[PDB]
Structure 1
Amino acid sequence: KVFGRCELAAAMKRHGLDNYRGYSLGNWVCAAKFESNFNTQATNRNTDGSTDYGILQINSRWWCNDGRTPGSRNLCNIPCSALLSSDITASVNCAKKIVSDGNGMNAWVAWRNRCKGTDVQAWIRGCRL
């Protein structure tokens, strides 16, 4: 599914991401924009053989099982396929674990490089929330 900007802001708020670990909703919308362009079916293969899945491009080295990332973990206890669903529940619940890991949203390199310290409230401007 390709979400609209405000549609995704709403879904993320519905699932308790807004101000989760102190990160405002605009930070999460911005991260999703640059990770996936709001496409739940986004995938990206890394040089190490791991794969990133879904609207927040969650990686198979730690967070989900895809059966093809040797030595990896599955700390979200889900198949990586769950991260490609039109229903963002699995992505949001797994993102809550990731952002709790110690480095906050710096775990998403695209957030650090493209969203951190910018006027992220622009990402929810106009939205009925």
Structure 2
Amino acid sequence: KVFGRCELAAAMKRHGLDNYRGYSLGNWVCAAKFESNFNTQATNRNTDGSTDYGILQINSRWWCNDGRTPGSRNLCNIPCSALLSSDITASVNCAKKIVSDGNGMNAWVAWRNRCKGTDVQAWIRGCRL
């Protein structure tokens, strides 16, 4: 599924991401835009052989099991394919574990480079929330 901006904001709000660990909703919307262009089916392979999955590009080295990333952990205890669903619940739930891991939203390289320090409230402007 390719979300609209406000549709995703709403879904994220409903699933408790607004101000989760102090990160306002615009931060999560901005991260999703630049990580996946709001497409739940996005995948990208990394040099190390791991793959990033779904709207928040969650990596198979640590977070989910794809069956082809040797010695990886599966800290979210889910097949990576679950992260490609039109239902963002699994992605949101795993994201909450990641953002709690010590480095906050710096775990998302697109967030760090393209959202951090910018006016992220812009991402939710206009929306009915």
SS in 2 for 1:22: coil
- For residue 74 of structure 2, what is the aligned residue in structure 1? 74
Shift of 1:112: 0.3
SS in 2 for 1:18: coil
Structure 2 residue runs without a partner (length 5+): none
Shift of 1:2: 0.1
Shift of 1:61: 0.4
SS in 2 for 1:3: coil
C-alpha separation in 2, matches of 1:68 and 1:18: 34
Shift of 1:4: 0.2
Shift of 1:56: 0.3
Q: Give the TM-score, by structure 2 length.
A: 1.00
Deviations 1:93-112 (A, max 9, x none): 00000000000000001100
Structure 1 residue runs without a partner (length 5+): none
Shift of 1:126: 0.2
SS in 2 for 1:55: coil
C-alpha separation in 1, matches of 2:18 and 2:56: 15
C-alpha separation in 2, matches of 1:105 and 1:64: 18
Deviations 1:26-74 (A, max 9, x none): 0000000000000000000000000000000000000000010001000
Shift of 1:78: 0.3
- For residue 29 of structure 2, what is the aligned residue in structure 1? 29
Kindly report the root-mean-square deviation, in angstroms, between the aligned alpha carbons of the 2 structures: 0.2
C-alpha separation in 2, matches of 1:3 and 1:112: 22
C-alpha separation in 2, matches of 1:35 and 1:83: 14
C-alpha separation in 2, matches of 1:13 and 1:126: 15
C-alpha separation in 1, matches of 2:57 and 2:109: 10
Detail structure 1 runs of 4+ shifted over 2 Å in the superposition.
Answer: none
